[PDB]
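Researcher: Please generate the 3D structure of the following complex. Treat every line as part of one assembly.
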Amino acid sequence: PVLFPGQPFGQP
Amino acid sequence: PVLFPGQPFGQP
Amino acid sequence: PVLFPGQPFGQP
Amino acid sequence: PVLFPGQPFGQP
Amino acid sequence: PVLFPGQPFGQP
Amino acid sequence: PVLFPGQPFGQP
Amino acid sequence: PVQQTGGGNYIHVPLSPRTLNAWVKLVEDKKFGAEVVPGFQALSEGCTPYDINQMLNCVGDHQAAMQIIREIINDEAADWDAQHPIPGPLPAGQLRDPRGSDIAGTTSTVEEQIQWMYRPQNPVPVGNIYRRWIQIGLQKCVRMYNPTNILDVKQGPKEPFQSYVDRFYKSLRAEQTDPAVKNWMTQTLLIQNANPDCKLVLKGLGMNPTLEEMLTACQGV
Amino acid sequence: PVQQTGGGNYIHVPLSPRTLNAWVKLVEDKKFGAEVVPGFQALSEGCTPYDINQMLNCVGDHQAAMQIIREIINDEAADWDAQHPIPGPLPAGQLRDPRGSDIAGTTSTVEEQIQWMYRPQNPVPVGNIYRRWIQIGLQKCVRMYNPTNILDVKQGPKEPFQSYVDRFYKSLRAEQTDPAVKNWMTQTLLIQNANPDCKLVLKGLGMNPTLEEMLTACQGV
Amino acid sequence: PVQQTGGGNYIHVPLSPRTLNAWVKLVEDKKFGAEVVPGFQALSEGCTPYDINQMLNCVGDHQAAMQIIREIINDEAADWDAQHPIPGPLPAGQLRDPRGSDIAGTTSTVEEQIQWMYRPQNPVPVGNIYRRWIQIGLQKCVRMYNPTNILDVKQGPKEPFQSYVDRFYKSLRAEQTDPAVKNWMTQTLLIQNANPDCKLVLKGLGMNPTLEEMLTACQGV
Amino acid sequence: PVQQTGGGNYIHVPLSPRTLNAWVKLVEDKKFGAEVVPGFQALSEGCTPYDINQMLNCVGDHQAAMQIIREIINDEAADWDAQHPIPGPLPAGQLRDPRGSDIAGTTSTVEEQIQWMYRPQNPVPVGNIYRRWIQIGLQKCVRMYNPTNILDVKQGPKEPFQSYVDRFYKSLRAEQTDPAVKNWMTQTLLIQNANPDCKLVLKGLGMNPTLEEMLTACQGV
Amino acid sequence: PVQQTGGGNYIHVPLSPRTLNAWVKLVEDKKFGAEVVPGFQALSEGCTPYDINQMLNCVGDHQAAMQIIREIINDEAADWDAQHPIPGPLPAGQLRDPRGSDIAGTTSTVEEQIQWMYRPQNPVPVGNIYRRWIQIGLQKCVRMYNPTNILDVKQGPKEPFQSYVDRFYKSLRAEQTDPAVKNWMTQTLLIQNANPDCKLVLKGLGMNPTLEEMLTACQGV
Amino acid sequence: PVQQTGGGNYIHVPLSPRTLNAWVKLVEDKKFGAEVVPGFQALSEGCTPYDINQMLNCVGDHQAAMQIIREIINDEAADWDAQHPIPGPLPAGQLRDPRGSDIAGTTSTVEEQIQWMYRPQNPVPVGNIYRRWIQIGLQKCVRMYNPTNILDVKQGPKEPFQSYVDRFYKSLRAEQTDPAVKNWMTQTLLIQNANPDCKLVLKGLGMNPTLEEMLTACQGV
Ligand SMILES: O=P(O)(O)O[C@H]1[C@H](OP(=O)(O)O)[C@@H](OP(=O)(O)O)[C@H](OP(=O)(O)O)[C@@H](OP(=O)(O)O)[C@H]1OP(=O)(O)O
Ligand SMILES: O=P(O)(O)O[C@H]1[C@H](OP(=O)(O)O)[C@@H](OP(=O)(O)O)[C@H](OP(=O)(O)O)[C@@H](OP(=O)(O)O)[C@H]1OP(=O)(O)O
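Model: Done. Output below.
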C-alpha cells in the first residue's frame, strides 16, 4: 500500500 | 472518424 | 478595395 | 512654442 | 533558546 | 540635517 | 506550445493557465459569439495541437457545440487523408508522414508534431491546420446559437440609427455569405429596413452613400 | 517542475503558487466536475510528481474523493511493481530502477525523479505516469459526486431542445462506457427522451440526422 | 509581434492576451473616446499588422465604427499603391515589393512583414504604416460618436469654471482643426462662453491671460 | 531565495511579494487549517531561511500560534546542536559549521546559508531543515485551533453520508496518530458513528468495504 | 523604454500597458494630488520621452491641467534652446545636437533619443530632462486643484491632534516655499492653529518640541 | 534596484509599480501596524536608496509619521558622519567616501550608490544601511499610532483566552523592551490579567507552563 488511508500524499 | 461522438478531444 | 464591407480584417 | 494649445503631446 | 519569547524571527 | 521638515525624501 | 534550445533543436512547453482560463471565459460570457473564433486564435498562436485539445477539453459546458466542432474535424481530416494518402513503407524508423488523426494530436504526440513543424524538409504547420478546421466548427456553432437574420432586423421610431446599423453589421459578420452580397446588403437592405421616412433621410445622400455620410446625416433625425 | 542548465544538466524548480491556487479553485467551483481532470493536466504539464502531490495536499476539502484517488494510486503501482519487478543487486551506487512508491514521489525525491526522466538510457516519464493514475481516481470521484444518468435525463414541454442535448452530451462525457454505445446513445436515446411529438420533429430528418441538422430543425418548435 | 534570435535573424511571436483584452476594454468603457487612438498605439508598439488585425477582429461590438476604419484602410492603401506601383518582374523568388494589401496583412503573412521590416536594404515599417491608417479611421469614429461642439459648450451660473474649461479642452483635442484656430479658440471662445459677468472676471487679467492665471483668478467667483 | 551566475557561483534574491501575500491569506482565510502547512512549503520551495523568517514576520495576527512555532524551533535546534556539536578551532577563516541559530538565519546571513547549500563538500540544505521544524510547530497550532475529535463527529438523520465522511477524513488528516490506527478508524469508526440503521446499509457490503463501495451504496439512502 | 543587445548596441521597446493604466488611475483616484508627481517618475524610470508622451496622451480627462503642463514644457525648452543654441553646420549626417522639441520627442524619434543617451561622447539623459519639466507642470496643477492654505487649517475641540498635524504636513509638502519657512511653520504655526488651551498642552514641552514629543503629549488630551 | 551585465559590471533598474502599490496598501490597511516594518524590507530587498525614497514619497497620507521617520534618518546619519568623517582630499576624481546624505540618496545618485556596493575594496551596503534607519522611524510611528499597554489588556468573563493571549503577544512584539522582561511578562502578567478564577485554571499547570499547555488547558473553561 503506497499511500495508507489519511496519509498526506508524498514523502513519508 | 478521428473523434467519435463524446470522445474527449486528443490522444485516445 | 483591400477589405470588402463586413470582411473580417486580415488574410482572406 | 513646442506644443501648441490642444496639440496631442509627441510627434506632429 | 534561539528565538526568545516575542522576538521577531530572524537576525537579532 | 539631511532631510529638512517637509522636504520630499531623496535628491534636492 | 514550442520553444527553441542551443544547437537549433526545438522542445515542447505547457499552455499557460491564464490562456486556458481566458478561452473558457470568452466562450461563457459571449455564449459562442463570433468574437470567440479569433480570441481562440490569438490565445493559441505559436501553440501545438495537444494544447488546443486541452483548451477545448476544459470547457465543461456548451458541449453540444463541441460535438458540432468534432463532426467538422473528422471531415476536414478525411479530405486531407484522401489528398495526402499513406505513402507506403517508410525507410528505417523515420517519423510517419502526417495523417488526419496526427494533425489533431490523437494518434500522435507533441514531440512528433514539433518535429514535423521543423522537419528539415516539408516542415508542416500541424498546429495551424488543426486551428483552421476548429474555427470552421466554431463558426457553425456561432450561427446555431444566434440564427437572427440580417433582413429580420428592423429599426424602431423611438430607436436610433447607429445601433440598428450596429445590429446589422454584427449579424453580417457572422454570416458566411459572398462578399458582393454583403456589399449589396450594406448599400441597400440597411436603407430599406428603416423607419417609414428614415429611409428617405438616408437617401438624401446622392447615391451609394458612404457610412460616414449616413451615420452623420441621420444623427438626431 | 524541471528546468535545464549549461552542459546539458537538468534541475528542479518550485510549482507556481498561481497554478496551485487555480487547481484548488477548479476543484471547489466545479465540485469535482469532469472539467477538473484536464485542468489538472494543463496546470501540471512539464512538472514532476512531488509538485503534483503538493497540489493535491493543498485542497483541504472534498477529502473523501482524495481517499478514492489514493485507493487508485496504490493499485496502479502494485500493477507496475509486478510488471516491473525489483531487478536485484545494482552495480555501484547507480539510481534504483523506479518502483510503485518512486513514481508517486514517496520513497524518492525530485532530483531522482528528474535524473530518471533524462537517464541517458531508459529515460522514464515518472511525472506523466503518476498523473494518468491520478486522472483515473479523479474520474471515479467525478462520477460519485454526480451519478445522474444519460437515460434519466428527459426534455420538458416548455423546456428547449439545445439545453436537453447540452445536459445529454455533458453526462455522456463523464461516463467511461464504450464509444459505439456512446454513438448509439447519441443517435437514438436523444430522439427517444424528448417531448411526446418533439421526437417526431427530430425524426423529420431522413435518418442518422447530424447534430447540426437536429439543433436547427427544432429551433423554436 | 517580433523578436530576435542568434545570428541576427528575426522571428514572429503572439500578441499578449492581456493586451487584446485591454484594447477591447478601452473601446467598450470609453465608447470610442479620443483616448482610444493612443491606447491602441501603446498596446501595439513593437507589433506587426497580423496582430493589429486580431485585436480589431476581437471587438464584437461598435461594428459600424469598424466599417468606417475599413473604408479608410482601403483608401490610404490605394494612395500607396499609386505612389508605390508594382515595379514589374522580380529577380528569382525575392519577396514582392509591399503593396496596399501587404501592409494590412491580407495578401501576405507575418514572416513576410517581419522580413520587410529588416530587409537588408529598404527596411520598411509595415507595422507602423498600418497603425497610422487605423488611427485616422478611429479618429473619424471618435467624432461620429461624440459630435458635441466646442462652441455649443456653455458655462452654468451654479456650475464651476475649471470643469467648463475641462469640457472645452477635451472637445478641442478630438477636433482635427488647425492649431492657430485652436489657439484663438483657447484665448477667446472660452472667455466668451461663460456666465454673464464671469466673462469679465476672466478679463480682469490684462490680456492673453495664461490658463494658470485664469484657473486661479475665478476660483470660487 | 537562491539563483546561479556564470562560473558556477550562486547568489541571493528577494522573496516575491505575491508569495508573502499568499502565505498571509492562506493563514487568515483558513485560520491555520491543515492546508496551511503545505501551502507554506510550495510557496517557500527553492528559498532560504531569511525569507521564511520574513513571511512569518509579516503575519501580524494569530501571534500566539507563532510563539508555539518558536517554542518548537528552539527545541529542534537544541537537538541539532547536541547531534552536531561545535567542532572546535576552524582553519583560517572558513565558514563556521552550521549550528541551531544558523539554520534559522538568526546568528547568520543569507550569503553564508547559500554558501553552505553548495559548500563543495557537505553541501547542507539549511533551507529545508528550518521548514521541517516550522511545519511541526504549524501542525501543533492547526490542532490547538481546531481540537474537534474524529470520534466526536456523528451523522444526522436528515444529514447526508458523503459530508460526514468528508468531516471524518479531514479531521483524521490533522491528527498525528499512527497509520494503522488511521486504517482501523477508516474501516470501523465511520460505520459506527452513523444513523441508527445507516450503520447497517454501510454493512450490507460483505466486509472491509472500499470507500467507492460505501459512498455509492448509501447514496440517497 | 530602452534595452541592450549583443555588441553593446541599444534598442527601443514599448511602455507596459500595466504602467500606462497605473499612471491614469493615480491621476483619476488622487485627482492630481502631490502623490501623482513621484508615481509618474517611478512608473517612467528607465523610459524615453515618446513613452512619457503616450502616458500623458492616454489620460482623457483633467485636460485643463495638461494644458498647464504644456505651457511649462514650452518654456523650459525655450530656456534650453537659448542655453544650448543650434551649433551650426554638422559634419556628414551625424545626429543633430538636441534642442527643445527633441527632448520632448516632437521633432524627433525614439531611436535618435536612445542614440543621444549613449552617444559615445556627451551621452545626454533626454528622458530624465523631459520628466523634470513635466513634474514642474504637474506640481502647478496639484496646487490649482487643492489651493487650501497651511494657515487656513484649524483644529476642532472634538477633533483630534494627530489628524490636524496630518492635514498640516500634507499641505506643506504640496507648497514650493523655502525650507526654513517650512521649518518655522512646523515649529510655530502648528502650535498656534490649535484649540484655545491645546496650544498650551503642546507648549508644556520646554521648547522646539520634536514631533514625537508633541504627538504623544496631547494623545487623549 | 540593481542588475548585472557581461564583464562583471552592474547597472540600475526601476522599482516595480506592483511593489510601490503593495507598500502603500500595507501602510493604509494596517494603519502603520508592526507588520509594516518587515513588509517594507521584503518589498525593498535587492534595492537601492533612491527607490526606497520613491516608495516613501508615494504614500500621500500618514504624513506626520513620515516626519518622525525623517527626524530619525537625520540622526543616524549624523552618527555615521561622526563615526565615518570626511577623509580629506581624494586622489584624482575617485568616488567620494559615503557620508550621511549619500546613504539616503540626497547628495548622491543611484549609479554612485551601486558603484559603492561593488567598490572593488570596501564594498558598502548603502541600500541596507538606509533601510535599517528607516525601520527605526517606522517602529516609533507604529507605537505612536497604537500606544495600548500590555498591562492595560485584561480578559473578559464571556471573552475567550486564546484571543486575550493574541492581543497580549501582538502588543509585546511592537514594544522595544528587553527580551528577559518580555519573557517574565509572557510567564506572569498573562496569568495575572485573566478572569478572577481563570488565573487559577492557568496555574493548574505545575509551573512556567508552556503556551501549548496553557492554550489547551483553558479551552472551553
Ligand atoms: O496579471 P496578474 O499578475 O495575474 O494580475 C491580475 C491583476 O493585476 P495586474 O493587472 O496588475 O497584473 C489582479 O490585480 P488588480 O489589477 O485587480 O489589482 C490580480 O489580483 P490581485 O488584485 O489580488 O493582485 C490578478 O492576479 P493575482 O491574483 O495572481 O495577483 C490578475 O487579475 P486580472 O486577470 O483580472 O487582471
Ligand atoms: O504576464 P505578463 O504579461 O508577462 O506580465 C508580467 C508577468 O505577469 P504574471 O505574474 O501575471 O504572469 C510576470 O510573471 P511571470 O509571467 O514571469 O510568471 C510578473 O512578475 P512575476 O514573475 O514576479 O509574477 C510581472 O510583474 P511586474 O509588472 O510586477 O514585474 C508582469 O509584468 P507586466 O504586466 O508589466 O508585463
